[PDB]
Structures are given as structure tokens and as C-alpha cells.
mmCIF file of C-alpha atoms and ligand atoms in Angstrom:
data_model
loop_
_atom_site.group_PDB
_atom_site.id
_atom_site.type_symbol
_atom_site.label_atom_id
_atom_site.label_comp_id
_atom_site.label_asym_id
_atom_site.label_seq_id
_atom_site.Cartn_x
_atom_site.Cartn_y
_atom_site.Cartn_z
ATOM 1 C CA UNK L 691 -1.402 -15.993 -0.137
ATOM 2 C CA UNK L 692 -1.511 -13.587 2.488
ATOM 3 C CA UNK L 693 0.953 -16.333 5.150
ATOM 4 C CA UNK L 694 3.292 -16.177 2.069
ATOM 5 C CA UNK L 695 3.767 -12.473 1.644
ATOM 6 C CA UNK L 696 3.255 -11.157 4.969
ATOM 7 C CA UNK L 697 4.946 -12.376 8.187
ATOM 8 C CA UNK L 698 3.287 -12.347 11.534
ATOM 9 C CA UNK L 699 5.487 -9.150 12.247
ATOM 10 C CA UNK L 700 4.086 -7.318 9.297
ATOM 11 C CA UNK L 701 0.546 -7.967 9.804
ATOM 12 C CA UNK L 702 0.633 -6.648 12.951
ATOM 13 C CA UNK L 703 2.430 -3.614 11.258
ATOM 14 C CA UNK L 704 -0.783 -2.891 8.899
ATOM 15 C CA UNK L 705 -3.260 -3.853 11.524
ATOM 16 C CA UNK L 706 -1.393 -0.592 13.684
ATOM 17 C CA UNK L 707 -1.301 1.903 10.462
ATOM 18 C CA UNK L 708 -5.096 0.303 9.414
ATOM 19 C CA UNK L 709 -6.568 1.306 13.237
ATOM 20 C CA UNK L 710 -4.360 5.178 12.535
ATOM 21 C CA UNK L 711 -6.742 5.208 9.577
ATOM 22 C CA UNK L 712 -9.669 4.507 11.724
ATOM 23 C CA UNK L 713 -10.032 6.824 14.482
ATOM 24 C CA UNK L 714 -13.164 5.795 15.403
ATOM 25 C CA UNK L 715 -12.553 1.733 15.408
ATOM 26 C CA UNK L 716 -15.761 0.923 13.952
ATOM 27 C CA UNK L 717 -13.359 -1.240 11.344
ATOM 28 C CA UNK L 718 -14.309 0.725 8.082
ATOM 29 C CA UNK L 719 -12.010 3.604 6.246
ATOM 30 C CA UNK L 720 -14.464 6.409 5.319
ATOM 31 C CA UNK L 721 -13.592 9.206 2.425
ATOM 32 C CA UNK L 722 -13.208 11.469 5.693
ATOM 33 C CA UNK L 723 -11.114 9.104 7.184
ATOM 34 C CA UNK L 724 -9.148 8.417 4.397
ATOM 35 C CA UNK L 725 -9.041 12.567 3.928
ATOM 36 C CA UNK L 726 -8.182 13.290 7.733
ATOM 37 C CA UNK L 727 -4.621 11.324 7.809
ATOM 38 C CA UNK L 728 -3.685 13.588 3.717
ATOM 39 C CA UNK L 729 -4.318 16.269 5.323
ATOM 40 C CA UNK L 730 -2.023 15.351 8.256
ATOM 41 C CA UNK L 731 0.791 14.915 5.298
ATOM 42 C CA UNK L 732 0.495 17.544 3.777
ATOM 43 C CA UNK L 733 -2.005 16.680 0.737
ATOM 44 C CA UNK L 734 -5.180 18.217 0.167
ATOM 45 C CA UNK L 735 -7.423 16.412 -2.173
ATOM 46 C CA UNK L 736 -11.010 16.673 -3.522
ATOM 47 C CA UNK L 737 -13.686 13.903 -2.559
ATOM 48 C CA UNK L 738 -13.539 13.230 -6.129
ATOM 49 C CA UNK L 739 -10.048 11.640 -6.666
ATOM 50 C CA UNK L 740 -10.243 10.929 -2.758
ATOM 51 C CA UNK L 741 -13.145 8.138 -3.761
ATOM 52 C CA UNK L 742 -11.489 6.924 -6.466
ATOM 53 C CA UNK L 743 -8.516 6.026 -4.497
ATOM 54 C CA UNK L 744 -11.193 3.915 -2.152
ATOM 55 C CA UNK L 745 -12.841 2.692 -5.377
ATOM 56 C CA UNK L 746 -9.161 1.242 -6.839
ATOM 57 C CA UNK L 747 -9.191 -1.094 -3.764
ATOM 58 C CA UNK L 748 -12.557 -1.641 -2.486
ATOM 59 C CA UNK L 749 -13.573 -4.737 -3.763
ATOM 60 C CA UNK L 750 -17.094 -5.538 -2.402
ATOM 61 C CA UNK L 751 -18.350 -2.046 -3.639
ATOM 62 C CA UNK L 752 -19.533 -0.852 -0.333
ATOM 63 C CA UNK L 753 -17.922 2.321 -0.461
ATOM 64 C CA UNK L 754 -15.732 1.354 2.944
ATOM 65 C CA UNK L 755 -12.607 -0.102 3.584
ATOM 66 C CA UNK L 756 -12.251 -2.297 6.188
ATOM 67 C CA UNK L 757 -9.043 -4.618 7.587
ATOM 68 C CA UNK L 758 -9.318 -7.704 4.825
ATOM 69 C CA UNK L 759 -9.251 -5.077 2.002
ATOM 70 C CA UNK L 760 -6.682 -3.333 3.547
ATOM 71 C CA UNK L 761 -4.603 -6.304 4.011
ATOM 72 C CA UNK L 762 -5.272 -7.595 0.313
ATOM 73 C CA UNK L 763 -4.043 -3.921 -0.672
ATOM 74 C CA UNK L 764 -0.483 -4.140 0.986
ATOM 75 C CA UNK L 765 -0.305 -8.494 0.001
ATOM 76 C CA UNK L 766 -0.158 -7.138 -3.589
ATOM 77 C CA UNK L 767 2.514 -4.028 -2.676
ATOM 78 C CA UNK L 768 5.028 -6.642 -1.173
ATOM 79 C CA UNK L 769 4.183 -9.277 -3.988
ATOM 80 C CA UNK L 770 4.975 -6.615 -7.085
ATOM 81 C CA UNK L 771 8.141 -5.347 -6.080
ATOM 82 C CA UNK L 772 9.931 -8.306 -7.612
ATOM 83 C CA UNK L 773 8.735 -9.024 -11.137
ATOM 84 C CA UNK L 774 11.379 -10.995 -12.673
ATOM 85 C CA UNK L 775 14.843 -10.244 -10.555
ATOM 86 C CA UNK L 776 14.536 -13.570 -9.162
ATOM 87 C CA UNK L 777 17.530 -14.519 -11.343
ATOM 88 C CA UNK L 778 19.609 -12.309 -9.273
ATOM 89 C CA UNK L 779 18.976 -14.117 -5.955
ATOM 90 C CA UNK L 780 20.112 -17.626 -7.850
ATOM 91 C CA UNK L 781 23.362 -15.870 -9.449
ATOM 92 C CA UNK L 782 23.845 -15.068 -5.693
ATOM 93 C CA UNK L 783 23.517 -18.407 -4.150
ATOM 94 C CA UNK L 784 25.963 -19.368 -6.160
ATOM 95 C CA UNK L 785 28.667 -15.970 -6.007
ATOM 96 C CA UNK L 786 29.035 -16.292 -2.440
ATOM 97 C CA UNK L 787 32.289 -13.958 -2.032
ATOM 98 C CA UNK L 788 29.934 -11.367 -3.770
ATOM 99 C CA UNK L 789 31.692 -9.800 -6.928
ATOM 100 C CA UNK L 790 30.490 -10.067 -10.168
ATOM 101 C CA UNK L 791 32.098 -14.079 -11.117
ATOM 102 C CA UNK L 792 31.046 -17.201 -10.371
ATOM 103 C CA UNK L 793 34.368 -19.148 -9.664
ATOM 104 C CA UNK L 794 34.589 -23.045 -9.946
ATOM 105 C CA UNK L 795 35.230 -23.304 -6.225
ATOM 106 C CA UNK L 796 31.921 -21.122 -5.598
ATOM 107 C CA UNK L 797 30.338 -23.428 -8.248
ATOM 108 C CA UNK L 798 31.942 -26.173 -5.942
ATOM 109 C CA UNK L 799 30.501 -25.027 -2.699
ATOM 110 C CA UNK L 800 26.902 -24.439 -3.729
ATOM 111 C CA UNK L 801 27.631 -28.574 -5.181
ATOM 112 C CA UNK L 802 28.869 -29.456 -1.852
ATOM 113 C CA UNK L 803 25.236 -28.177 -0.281
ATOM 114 C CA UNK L 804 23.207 -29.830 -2.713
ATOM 115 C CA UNK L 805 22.075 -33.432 -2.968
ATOM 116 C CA UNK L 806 24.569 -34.243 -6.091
ATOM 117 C CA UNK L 807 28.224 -34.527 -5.404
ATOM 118 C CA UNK L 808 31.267 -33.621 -8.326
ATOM 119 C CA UNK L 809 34.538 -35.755 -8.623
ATOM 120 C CA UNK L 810 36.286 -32.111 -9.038
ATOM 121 C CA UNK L 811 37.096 -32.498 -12.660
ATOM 122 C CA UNK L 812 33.281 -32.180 -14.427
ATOM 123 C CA UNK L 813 32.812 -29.316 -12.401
ATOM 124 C CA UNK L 814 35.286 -27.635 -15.354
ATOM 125 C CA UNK L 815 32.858 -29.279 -17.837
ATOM 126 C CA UNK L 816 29.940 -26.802 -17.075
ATOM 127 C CA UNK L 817 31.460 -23.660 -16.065
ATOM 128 C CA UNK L 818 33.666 -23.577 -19.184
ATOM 129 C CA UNK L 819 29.953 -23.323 -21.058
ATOM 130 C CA UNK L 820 28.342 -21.215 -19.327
ATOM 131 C CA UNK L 821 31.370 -19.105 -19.379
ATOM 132 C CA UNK L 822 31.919 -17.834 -23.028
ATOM 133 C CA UNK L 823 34.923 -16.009 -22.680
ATOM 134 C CA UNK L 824 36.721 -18.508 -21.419
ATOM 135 C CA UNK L 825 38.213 -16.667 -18.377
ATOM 136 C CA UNK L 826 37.194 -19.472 -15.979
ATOM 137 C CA UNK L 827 34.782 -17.587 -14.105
ATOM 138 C CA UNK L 828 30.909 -16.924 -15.228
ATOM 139 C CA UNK L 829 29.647 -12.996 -14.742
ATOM 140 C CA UNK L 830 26.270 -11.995 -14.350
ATOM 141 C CA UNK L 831 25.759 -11.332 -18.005
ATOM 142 C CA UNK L 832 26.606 -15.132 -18.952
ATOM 143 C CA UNK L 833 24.483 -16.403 -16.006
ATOM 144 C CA UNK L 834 21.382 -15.088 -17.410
ATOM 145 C CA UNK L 835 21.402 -15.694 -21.423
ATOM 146 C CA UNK L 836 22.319 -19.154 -20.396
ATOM 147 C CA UNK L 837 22.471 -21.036 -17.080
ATOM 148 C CA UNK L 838 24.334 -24.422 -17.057
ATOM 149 C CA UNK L 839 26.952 -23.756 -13.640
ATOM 150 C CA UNK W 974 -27.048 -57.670 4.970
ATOM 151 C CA UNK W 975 -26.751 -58.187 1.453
ATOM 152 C CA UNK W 976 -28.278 -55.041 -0.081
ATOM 153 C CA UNK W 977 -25.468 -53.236 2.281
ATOM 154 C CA UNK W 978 -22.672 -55.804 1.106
ATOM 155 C CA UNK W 979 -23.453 -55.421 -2.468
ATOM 156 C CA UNK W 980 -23.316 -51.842 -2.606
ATOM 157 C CA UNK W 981 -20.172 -51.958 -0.782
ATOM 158 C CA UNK W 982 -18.667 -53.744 -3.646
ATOM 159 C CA UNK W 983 -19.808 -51.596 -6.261
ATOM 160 C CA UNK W 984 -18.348 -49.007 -4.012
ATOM 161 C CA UNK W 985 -14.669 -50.180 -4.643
ATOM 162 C CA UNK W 986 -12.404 -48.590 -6.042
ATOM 163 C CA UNK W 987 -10.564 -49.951 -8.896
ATOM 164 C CA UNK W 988 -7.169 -48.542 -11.132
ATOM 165 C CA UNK W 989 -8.078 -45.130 -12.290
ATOM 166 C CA UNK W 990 -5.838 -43.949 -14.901
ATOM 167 C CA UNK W 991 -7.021 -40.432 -14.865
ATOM 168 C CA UNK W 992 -6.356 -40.127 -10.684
ATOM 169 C CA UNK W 993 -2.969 -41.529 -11.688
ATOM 170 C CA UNK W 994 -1.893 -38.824 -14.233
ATOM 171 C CA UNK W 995 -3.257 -36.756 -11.945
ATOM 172 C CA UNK W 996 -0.980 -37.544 -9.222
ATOM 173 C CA UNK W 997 2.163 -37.956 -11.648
ATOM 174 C CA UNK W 998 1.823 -33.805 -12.659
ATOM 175 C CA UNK W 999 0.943 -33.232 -8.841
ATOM 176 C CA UNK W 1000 4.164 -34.574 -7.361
ATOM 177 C CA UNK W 1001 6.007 -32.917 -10.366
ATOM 178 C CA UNK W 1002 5.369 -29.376 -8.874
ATOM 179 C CA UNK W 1003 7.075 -30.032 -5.177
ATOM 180 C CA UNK W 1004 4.107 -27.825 -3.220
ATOM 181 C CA UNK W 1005 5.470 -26.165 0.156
ATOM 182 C CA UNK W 1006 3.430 -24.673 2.811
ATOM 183 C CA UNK W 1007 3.162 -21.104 4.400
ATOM 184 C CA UNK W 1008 4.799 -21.919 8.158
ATOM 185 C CA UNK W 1009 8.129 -23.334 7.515
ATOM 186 C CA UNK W 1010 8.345 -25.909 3.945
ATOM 187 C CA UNK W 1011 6.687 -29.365 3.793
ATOM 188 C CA UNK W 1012 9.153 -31.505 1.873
ATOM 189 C CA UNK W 1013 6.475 -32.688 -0.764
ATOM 190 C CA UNK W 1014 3.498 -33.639 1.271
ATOM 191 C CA UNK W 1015 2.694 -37.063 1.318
ATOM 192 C CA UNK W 1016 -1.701 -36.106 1.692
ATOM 193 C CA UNK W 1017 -3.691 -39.543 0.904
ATOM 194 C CA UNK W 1018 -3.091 -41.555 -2.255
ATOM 195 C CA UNK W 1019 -5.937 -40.934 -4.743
ATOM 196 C CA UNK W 1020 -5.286 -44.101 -6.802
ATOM 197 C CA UNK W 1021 -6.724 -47.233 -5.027
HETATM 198 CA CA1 LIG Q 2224 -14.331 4.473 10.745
HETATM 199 CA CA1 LIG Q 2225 -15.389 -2.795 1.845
HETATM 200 CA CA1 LIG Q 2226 32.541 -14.884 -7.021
HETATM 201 CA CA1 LIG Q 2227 33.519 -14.809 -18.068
#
């Protein structure tokens, strides 16, 4: 959703580059429009590819774009960045100096924030198999073929 | 009177095993909202 994506900040953003687009305010991107602001970077298209750029994001066909098409156009820009790098973020949360290890007093504090609480010796349990080469700390490489710390 | 009261009663609601799987998967997700994070809504019981 839209409230997910895009923050109140950002939407106001796009509603300021949307109304650069349309110079006139009448709420609709036309092919001259669209041409005007290319031109003003540099670019110098043909109608022909400059429709089909409309086309690829006009979605009730009426050869315009207006606001909630523009809108739906940048939800799916911020969206598709991250396809599956989410893993990163978690090995993060719990490598809090910031290097490449997961140590068993990171492993600890991330434990301390949660809900569940470690006597301080099972916390050895699960980092020794997650990591495989028994240094005591888990890198990013054993974090992500198998996550158990 | 009693046309109303009878149809009332056949109006009840009784244990619905389908609405109650239903709700079992529903509250295995843990939804959030937009605005902040709701802390697994609590929106009206379906079963009953
Ligand atoms: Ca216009
Ligand atoms: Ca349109
Ligand atoms: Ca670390
Ligand atoms: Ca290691």
C-alpha cells in the first residue's frame, strides 16, 4: 500500500515534481507535457517512444497521466529496490558493533531486547551451529545458508 | 411478536468450525497497520 511505501514527506515530494510535470494544473500529464520537462534535460525523443513511456504506466488507457497514476508509478520504484536483501537488515540487528561477526555477547544483547531471556550458557548452544568454523563468532556467509543465532 | 422472535432464533449463531480455522490462520500472520504497528488487532470475534 501506498501508507506503507510512501511517508507523508514523500508524497508531498511527488505531488511537487507531479505539478513540475503539469504546467498547466489541469491534473493530467500530456505527451507534450511529458516532452517539455526531456527537453529541459537534455533528451530529445520522438512522440513515438514518448507515448509508450505514458502507455507503460497509464493504467485506465486514457492516454493521460494524472496524480493516482503517478503515485502508483513511484509506490512500485520505492517497493523494488529491495528484492531479497532483507536478510541483511536481520544479520544487522543482530551485529550491532558493525563488522562482519556476530559475537555471543551481540547474540546476547539482541536476547536481552526480545521477549525470551538466556541463562548465559545455551546462548553457546546456538551460535556454535550456526557458526561452522568454530571460531565463536557467525559471519555473514554462515548467517544466511543457515540461521539458528 | 412471535413471527419476529422466531426468526430471531433461527438467526443465532451457533459453533462454526470453518469461522474458527479461519481465525486460527488469521492470528497466525500478526497483521500491522500503516500509521505506527497494531500489536495483532483484536477486530470482533467471528466465532459465536
Ligand atoms: Ca496538463
Ligand atoms: Ca490516466
Ligand atoms: Ca559483531
Ligand atoms: Ca565463523
Amino acid at each position: 500500500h501506498m501508507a506503507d511505501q510512501l511517508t507523508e514527506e514523500q508524497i508531498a515530494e511527488f505531488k511537487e515534481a507531479f505539478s513540475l510535470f503539469d504546467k498547466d494544473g489541469d491534473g493530467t500529464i500530456t505527451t507534450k507535457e511529458l516532452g517539455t520537462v526531456m527537453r529541459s534535460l537534455g533528451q530529445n525523443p520522438t512522440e513515438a517512444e514518448l507515448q509508450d513511456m505514458i502507455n507503460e504506466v497509464d493504467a485506465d488507457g486514457n492516454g493521460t497521466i494524472d496524480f493516482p497514476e503517478f503515485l502508483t508509478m513511484m509506490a512500485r520504484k520505492m517497493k523494488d529496490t529491495d528484492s531479497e536483501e532483507e536478510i541483511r537488515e536481520a544479520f544487522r540487528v543482530f551485529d550491532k558493533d558493525g563488522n562482519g561477526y556476530i559475537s555471543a555477547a551481540e547474540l546476547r544483547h539482541v536476547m536481552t531486547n526480545l521477549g525470551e531471556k538466556l541463562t548465559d550458557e545455551e546462548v553457546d548452544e546456538m551460535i556454535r551451529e550456526a557458526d561452522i568454523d568454530g571460531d565463536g563468532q557467525v559471519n555473514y556467509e554462515e548467517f544466511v545458508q543457515m540461521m539458528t543465532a | 411478536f412471535f413471527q419476529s422472535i422466531q426468526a430471531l432464533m433461527q438467526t443465532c449463531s451457533v459453533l462454526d468450525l470453518n469461522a474458527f480455522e479461519r481465525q486460527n490462520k488469521a492470528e497466525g500472520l500478526g497483521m500491522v497497520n500503516e500509521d505506527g504497528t497494531v500489536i495483532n488487532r483484536q477486530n470482533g470475534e467471528k466465532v459465536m
